[PDB]
Design a protein around this ligand. Structure first.
Ligand SMILES: Cc1cc(CNCCS(C)(=O)=O)ccc1Br
Ligand SMILES: [Cl-]
Ligand code: NA
Lengths: 301, 300
C-alpha cells in the first residue's frame, strides 16, 4: 500500500532530449526519427519577443543558424519548418533511441509526466495535471523551455506537452507537439494572465477512493446525493461540474470499495461545507485533484 | 518559479531492473556489471517466513534454482553469495547498460527517488525521504519487493535503498545495497513495529527558506529564539531536535535570504502554534519535511 504522486519511468524520453541553440538562445528539443522539435521562440532575440513576426524571422534564418547537440555529438540541420508555435529541424540522422510514440492532445483534468531539462540534459521528473484554465503548476527555471510532458501506454510514448513560458503567477503555458497552445496564450512578451482556475472534481473523488483503499476512511458517511444537488454545491466552491461520464469512469473504484460516486459525493459535499475538522487525508490538508481515476486504478491495482 | 516533489530521471535505473524467480517467488533484482542484487527473502517459502535460516536455505540452492530474466533474455546464474540481507547472483553477462554508480548508506532526513517495479518492469518513479524512524512512506504493492531508491549526482547513480517489506502501519522497510537494514528491522515476518515517527525539522526550515525565495513572507515574525528554547517547543509537536549541524547546513539559505536560522526557527514555532489560518506555503496547507537543504538549492 501507500499513495504517492508518481511519474512514468522517464528513460524512453531521456533518450530523445537534445540541446538546441539559435544565436544566444539555448533550450531543449525533442529528437524523434530525423526531426528535432522545439519552441519556435528559439529564433527570437529579446528585442524580437515584444512583437515577433515568426514568418519573417524564419525566412531570414537558414539551417546553419541552428546548433543541435545530442550530449557530445553535433547533429547537422538539413531542413527547417514551422508548425504553429513549434520549430521542426530536420537532421541528417534518425535518433537510434526513438521509442514507439505518437503526438496526442490532452484534455483539462488529464495528467502527464514532465521531464524537466536544462541545456538538453534531463534534470527532474514530476507528475502534473493540465488545469481547467489550461496552465500547469510545474517547476521550471531558465533553459527549461522545450521540456516535454508524456504518458506511457505499454511500450508507446504519447507526447502531449512542450513548455514555452512561465506566466506572472508562477504557473506554466505550453503547446502540444503540433505547436497548438493549451489555453488562450501567445508566444510573445506581453501581458498574459491565467483564468481563475477550478478544482478537478472527478480527480478529487478518485483521490478519496485512493484514501479509502489505503485505510483512511473517516470522511465516509451514511448519506448519498444527486448530480444536480452536488453540482449546485460544486459550482459554489469553484469545482468543475460532475458529468454522468465522470460517474462511469469512477465505476471500478465504486466497486472495489462499496462507496458509490454520489455516496462519495456526499462525503465531498460535506468536506467542502464543514472542512476537514482539522484531520488529513493521505497526508494532505488540501483536497488533491491531480490524480485521475486511471491514475488511482493504475497505482493501487 | 514553482516548487514540486521532483524525482531523478529514472532511465539509468530502468536499464538495470530484471526479474528474479526462486520457487514460486518472483520479485525485482538490480543488474550491475555481472551481479544481480535482490532481497535474500526470495529464497523463502510460507514455513520459512517467521524464522528463516538463510545460510541453511541458501546452501541447498544451485545456480539453476534462480531464473533471472532481463526483458525477454534469460540470464545464466554462475554463482550466488549472501551479504547481510541481500543476495548477489553472479551471471555470465555484464549489463551493457550499467551506468556509473556507487552504493551509499543515507541518514534519516535524506531524500531519494524510488523506481517502483513489478516482474522487473518499471511502473513509476516518486521522491521519498528516510523518516527519523528509519522507514519510508512509499507506494508498494506485492511484487515490488527488491525495488531501489537512488540519487543521481553529476551522471553517477548513487543507490541507497532496496525495498524488502511493508510493516503493519503501511510504511516500508529496506536495506542499503550492502544488505544492512535501515533501522531495527529484520527480514522475518515476526511482529515488528517502527518507532513513533517525527517531523524532519531541518527539511521544514529549508522549505520555509524556499517559500521566502519564491516570494512568500506572510509567516515571518520579528522574533528570534535560542537553539535550546526552539527544541523544547519543537519536541512538544514531535519535531526532531535541531542540532548545530542542522544550523550550519542552513547557513547558505540564511545568507541567500538574509534571515538568520534562529529567526526562521521563531517563524516555525509560531506556525506550529497558529496553523496557516486558511493559507498555503508553496501550495501546501501542511509543513513539508521531504525537501533537504541541498534539494532546495538544486531545484531553486
Ligand atoms: C521473511 C520474509 C519472507 C517472505 C516470503 N515470500 C512471501 C509469499 S511467498 C510464499 O510467495 O514467498 C517475504 C518477506 C519476508 Br520479510
Ligand atoms: Cl545522507
Ligand atoms: Na456517504
Amino acid at each position: 500500500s501507500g499513495f504517492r504522486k508518481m511519474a512514468f519511468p522517464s528513460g524512453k524520453v531521456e533518450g530523445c532530449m537534445v540541446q538546441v541553440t539559435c544565436g544566444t538562445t539555448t533550450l531543449n528539443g525533442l529528437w524523434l526519427d530525423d526531426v528535432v522539435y522545439c519552441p519556435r521562440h528559439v529564433i527570437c532575440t529579446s528585442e524580437d519577443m515584444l512583437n515577433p513576426n515568426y514568418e519573417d524571422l524564419l525566412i531570414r534564418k537558414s539551417n546553419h543558424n541552428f546548433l543541435v547537440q545530442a550530449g557530445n555529438v553535433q547533429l547537422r540541420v538539413i531542413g527547417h519548418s514551422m508548425q504553429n508555435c513549434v520549430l521542426k529541424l530536420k537532421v541528417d540522422t534518425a535518433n537510434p533511441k526513438t521509442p514507439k510514440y505518437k503526438f496526442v492532445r490532452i484534455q483539462p483534468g488529464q495528467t502527464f509526466s514532465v521531464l524537466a531539462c536544462y541545456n538538453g540534459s534531463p534534470s527532474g521528473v514530476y507528475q502534473c495535471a493540465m488545469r481547467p484554465n489550461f496552465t500547469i503548476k510545474g517547476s521550471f527555471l531558465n533553459g527549461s523551455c522545450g521540456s516535454v510532458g508524456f504518458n506511457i501506454d505499454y511500450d508507446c510514448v504519447s507526447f502531449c506537452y512542450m513548455h514555452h513560458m512561465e506566466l506572472p503567477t508562477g504557473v506554466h503555458a505550453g503547446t502540444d507537439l503540433e505547436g497548438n497552445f493549451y489555453g488562450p496564450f501567445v508566444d510573445r512578451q506581453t501581458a498574459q494572465a491565467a483564468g481563475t482556475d477550478t478544482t478537478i472534481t472527478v480527480n478529487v473523488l478518485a483521490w478519496l477512493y485512493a484514501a479509502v483503499i489505503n485505510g483512511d476512511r473517516w470522511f465516509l458517511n451514511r448519506f448519498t446525493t444527486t448530480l444536480n444537488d452536488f453540482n449546485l454545491v460544486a459550482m459554489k466552491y469553484n469545482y468543475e461540474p460532475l458529468t454522468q461520464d465522470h460517474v462511469d469512469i469512477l465505476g471500478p473504484l465504486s466497486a472495489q470499495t462499496g462507496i458509490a460516486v454520489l455516496d462519495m459525493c456526499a462525503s465531498l459535499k460535506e468536506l467542502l461545507q464543514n472542512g476537514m475538522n482539522g484531520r488529513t487525508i493521505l497526508g494532505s490538508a488540501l483536497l488533491e485533484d491531480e490524480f485521475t481515476p486511471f491514475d488511482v486504478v493504475r497505482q493501487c491495482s
